[PDB]
Write an enzyme that holds these catalytic residues in place. Structure first.
Site, PDB file in Angstrom:
ATOM      1  N   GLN A 169      -0.615   6.045  11.073  1.00  0.00           N
ATOM      2  CA  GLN A 169      -0.339   6.632   9.759  1.00  0.00           C
ATOM      3  C   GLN A 169       1.079   7.199   9.696  1.00  0.00           C
ATOM      4  O   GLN A 169       1.529   7.866  10.624  1.00  0.00           O
ATOM      5  CB  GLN A 169      -1.356   7.733   9.446  1.00  0.00           C
ATOM      6  CG  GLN A 169      -2.748   7.212   9.066  1.00  0.00           C
ATOM      7  CD  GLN A 169      -3.561   6.690  10.255  1.00  0.00           C
ATOM      8  OE1 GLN A 169      -3.542   7.258  11.343  1.00  0.00           O
ATOM      9  NE2 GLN A 169      -4.303   5.616  10.027  1.00  0.00           N
ATOM     10  N   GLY A 170       1.774   6.925   8.601  1.00  0.00           N
ATOM     11  CA  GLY A 170       3.156   7.369   8.437  1.00  0.00           C
ATOM     12  C   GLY A 170       4.172   6.318   8.866  1.00  0.00           C
ATOM     13  O   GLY A 170       5.328   6.396   8.461  1.00  0.00           O
ATOM     14  N   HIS A 199       0.811  -1.235   0.000  1.00  0.00           N
ATOM     15  CA  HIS A 199       0.000   0.000   0.000  1.00  0.00           C
ATOM     16  C   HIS A 199       0.849   1.294   0.000  1.00  0.00           C
ATOM     17  O   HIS A 199       0.303   2.386  -0.182  1.00  0.00           O
ATOM     18  CB  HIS A 199      -1.098  -0.019   1.078  1.00  0.00           C
ATOM     19  CG  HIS A 199      -0.643   0.388   2.448  1.00  0.00           C
ATOM     20  ND1 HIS A 199      -0.335  -0.527   3.433  1.00  0.00           N
ATOM     21  CD2 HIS A 199      -0.516   1.611   3.016  1.00  0.00           C
ATOM     22  CE1 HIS A 199       0.010   0.119   4.537  1.00  0.00           C
ATOM     23  NE2 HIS A 199      -0.106   1.418   4.313  1.00  0.00           N
ATOM     24  N   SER A 250       3.436   3.152   8.166  1.00  0.00           N
ATOM     25  CA  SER A 250       3.156   2.138   7.146  1.00  0.00           C
ATOM     26  C   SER A 250       4.402   1.650   6.421  1.00  0.00           C
ATOM     27  O   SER A 250       5.235   2.452   6.007  1.00  0.00           O
ATOM     28  CB  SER A 250       2.212   2.719   6.092  1.00  0.00           C
ATOM     29  OG  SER A 250       0.891   2.827   6.594  1.00  0.00           O
ATOM     30  N   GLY A 251       4.512   0.333   6.259  1.00  0.00           N
ATOM     31  CA  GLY A 251       5.639  -0.267   5.546  1.00  0.00           C
ATOM     32  C   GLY A 251       6.865  -0.526   6.401  1.00  0.00           C
ATOM     33  O   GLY A 251       7.784  -1.237   5.978  1.00  0.00           O
ATOM     34  N   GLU A 272      23.457   9.784   6.700  1.00  0.00           N
ATOM     35  CA  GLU A 272      22.440   9.358   5.747  1.00  0.00           C
ATOM     36  C   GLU A 272      23.012   8.863   4.427  1.00  0.00           C
ATOM     37  O   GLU A 272      24.084   9.283   3.985  1.00  0.00           O
ATOM     38  CB  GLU A 272      21.446  10.474   5.462  1.00  0.00           C
ATOM     39  CG  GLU A 272      20.732  10.978   6.695  1.00  0.00           C
ATOM     40  CD  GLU A 272      21.434  12.152   7.366  1.00  0.00           C
ATOM     41  OE1 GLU A 272      22.631  12.432   7.080  1.00  0.00           O
ATOM     42  OE2 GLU A 272      20.767  12.785   8.209  1.00  0.00           O
ATOM     43  N   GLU A 326      18.833   7.395   8.699  1.00  0.00           N
ATOM     44  CA  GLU A 326      18.097   8.554   9.217  1.00  0.00           C
ATOM     45  C   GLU A 326      17.834   8.458  10.710  1.00  0.00           C
ATOM     46  O   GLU A 326      17.497   7.389  11.222  1.00  0.00           O
ATOM     47  CB  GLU A 326      16.731   8.695   8.532  1.00  0.00           C
ATOM     48  CG  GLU A 326      16.813   9.112   7.069  1.00  0.00           C
ATOM     49  CD  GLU A 326      17.037  10.602   6.912  1.00  0.00           C
ATOM     50  OE1 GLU A 326      17.540  11.247   7.865  1.00  0.00           O
ATOM     51  OE2 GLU A 326      16.703  11.124   5.838  1.00  0.00           O
ATOM     52  N   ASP A 339       0.551   1.949  19.903  1.00  0.00           N
ATOM     53  CA  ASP A 339       0.284   1.372  18.576  1.00  0.00           C
ATOM     54  C   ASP A 339       1.166   2.051  17.531  1.00  0.00           C
ATOM     55  O   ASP A 339       1.736   3.110  17.785  1.00  0.00           O
ATOM     56  CB  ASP A 339      -1.200   1.623  18.258  1.00  0.00           C
ATOM     57  CG  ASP A 339      -1.761   0.750  17.139  1.00  0.00           C
ATOM     58  OD1 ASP A 339      -1.086  -0.155  16.581  1.00  0.00           O
ATOM     59  OD2 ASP A 339      -2.940   0.995  16.835  1.00  0.00           O
ATOM     60  N   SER A 340       1.272   1.438  16.354  1.00  0.00           N
ATOM     61  CA  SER A 340       1.784   2.140  15.177  1.00  0.00           C
ATOM     62  C   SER A 340       0.619   2.966  14.592  1.00  0.00           C
ATOM     63  O   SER A 340      -0.526   2.840  15.060  1.00  0.00           O
ATOM     64  CB  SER A 340       2.368   1.146  14.161  1.00  0.00           C
ATOM     65  OG  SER A 340       1.410   0.176  13.742  1.00  0.00           O
ATOM     66  N   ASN A 353      16.757  12.134  12.548  1.00  0.00           N
ATOM     67  CA  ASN A 353      15.854  13.261  12.299  1.00  0.00           C
ATOM     68  C   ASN A 353      15.564  13.345  10.798  1.00  0.00           C
ATOM     69  O   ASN A 353      16.471  13.641  10.015  1.00  0.00           O
ATOM     70  CB  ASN A 353      16.475  14.567  12.792  1.00  0.00           C
ATOM     71  CG  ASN A 353      15.494  15.721  12.726  1.00  0.00           C
ATOM     72  OD1 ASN A 353      14.691  15.830  11.793  1.00  0.00           O
ATOM     73  ND2 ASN A 353      15.526  16.572  13.744  1.00  0.00           N
ATOM     74  N   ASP A 380      -0.002  -7.572   1.787  1.00  0.00           N
ATOM     75  CA  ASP A 380       0.479  -6.175   1.796  1.00  0.00           C
ATOM     76  C   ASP A 380       2.005  -6.133   1.966  1.00  0.00           C
ATOM     77  O   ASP A 380       2.524  -5.813   3.032  1.00  0.00           O
ATOM     78  CB  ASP A 380      -0.247  -5.375   2.898  1.00  0.00           C
ATOM     79  CG  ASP A 380      -0.014  -3.881   2.797  1.00  0.00           C
ATOM     80  OD1 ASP A 380       0.529  -3.447   1.766  1.00  0.00           O
ATOM     81  OD2 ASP A 380      -0.390  -3.142   3.750  1.00  0.00           O
TER      82      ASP A 380
HETATM   83  N1  LIG Z   1      -1.448   0.106  13.795  1.00  0.00           N
HETATM   84  C1  LIG Z   1      -2.418   0.906  13.343  1.00  0.00           C
HETATM   85  N2  LIG Z   1      -3.409   1.205  14.071  1.00  0.00           N
HETATM   86  C2  LIG Z   1      -2.296   1.435  11.945  1.00  0.00           C
HETATM   87  C3  LIG Z   1      -1.304   0.888  11.136  1.00  0.00           C
HETATM   88  C4  LIG Z   1      -1.130   1.320   9.831  1.00  0.00           C
HETATM   89  C5  LIG Z   1      -1.948   2.318   9.333  1.00  0.00           C
HETATM   90  C6  LIG Z   1      -1.726   2.727   7.933  1.00  0.00           C
HETATM   91  N3  LIG Z   1      -2.120   3.827   7.461  1.00  0.00           N
HETATM   92  O1  LIG Z   1      -1.850   4.065   6.142  1.00  0.00           O
HETATM   93  C7  LIG Z   1      -1.816   5.416   5.695  1.00  0.00           C
HETATM   94  C8  LIG Z   1      -0.491   6.046   6.032  1.00  0.00           C
HETATM   95  O2  LIG Z   1       0.391   5.432   6.631  1.00  0.00           O
HETATM   96  O3  LIG Z   1      -0.281   7.307   5.668  1.00  0.00           O
HETATM   97  C9  LIG Z   1      -2.953   2.874  10.126  1.00  0.00           C
HETATM   98  C10 LIG Z   1      -3.131   2.436  11.451  1.00  0.00           C
HETATM   99 CA   LIG Z   2      18.505  13.108   8.779  1.00  0.00          CA
END
Ligand SMILES: N=C(N)c1ccc(/C=N/OCC(=O)O)cc1
Ligand SMILES: [Ca+2]
Length: 223
Positions: free
Chosen positions: A174-175, A40, A177-178, A62, A52, A171-172, A54, A84
């Site tokens: 947005q941002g 995604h 991701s990956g 870097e 990286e 939790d993880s 900062n 994914d």
């Molecule tokens: N652990 C979560 N609650 C979680 C994990 C991954 C996401 C992914 N968002 O995708 C859009 C982005 O990253 O900009 C959201 C919530």
């Molecule tokens: Ca840097």
């Protein structure tokens, strides 16, 4: 990362940032030429940023390397987020050192209860938005498959696992991701999805990397 801690500069040397004029996703360096991220996170014109801390300041360690190719898993479904996972090949090999290092692929799948390290530059708020400068880290346990399926009925495939805290707060997000989920020194998960971040009964859902080792190895042997 919500409810985590500041990792410390270059203590997560396999962590990468994917940049398309701005940071948009994390990734994990698996050898000098290849990064594992979420499908995604696919887009054209990716620059991989290694070493990286900062993300807004060039601090000296870097390596910025353009992607030469991106390979989204052949069965990735963007609706369900099944499979994914994506591989990104660097145009030139990274120079591996103390601050830029590869993370091992697993030989076996991780166990329920195992504490893993999740990292990224994503949102640090469960409500509202605040993005950190420096890399953030979270220790979180793998949840049982039955608790994972109960949290997200009808949505969890055998290529997904849950990790985190059902009480919410950590939790993880947005941002992130990956980015990596590393358990016992092996890349076991990729930040994939969840309902909001750090919400009660809505843990993080992660791509189950151990299912993809054959595909990864075959793909890198041929590209
Ligand atoms: N652990 C979560 N609650 C979680 C994990 C991954 C996401 C992914 N968002 O995708 C859009 C982005 O990253 O900009 C959201 C919530
Ligand atoms: Ca840097």
């Amino acid at each position: 990362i919500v409810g985590g801690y500041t990792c410390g500069a270059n203590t997560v040397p396999y962590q990468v940032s994917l940049n398309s004029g701005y940071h948009f996703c994390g990734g994990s360096l698996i050898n000098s030429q290849w990064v594992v991220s979420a499908a995604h996170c696919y887009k054209s014109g990716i620059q991989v940023r290694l070493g990286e801390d900062n993300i807004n300041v060039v601090e000296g360690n870097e390596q910025f390397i353009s992607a030469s190719k991106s390979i989204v898993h052949p069965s990735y479904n963007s609706n369900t987020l099944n499979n994914d996972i994506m591989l990104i090949k660097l145009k030139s090999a990274a120079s591996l050192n103390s601050r830029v290092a590869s993370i091992s692929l697993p030989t076996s799948c991780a166990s329920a209860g195992t504490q893993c390290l999740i990292s990224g530059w994503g949102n640090t708020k469960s409500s509202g938005t605040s993005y950190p400068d420096v890399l953030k880290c979270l220790k979180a346990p793998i949840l049982s498959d039955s608790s994972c399926k109960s949290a997200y009925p009808g949505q969890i495939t055998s290529n997904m696992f849950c990790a985190g805290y059902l009480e919410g707060g950590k939790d993880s997000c947005q941002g992130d991701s990956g980015g990596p989920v590393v358990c016992s020194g092996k890349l076991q998960g990729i930040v994939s999805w969840g309902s909001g971040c750090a919400q009660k009964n809505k843990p993080g859902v992660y791509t189950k990397v151990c299912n993809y080792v054959s595909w990864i190895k075959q793909t890198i042997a041929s590209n």
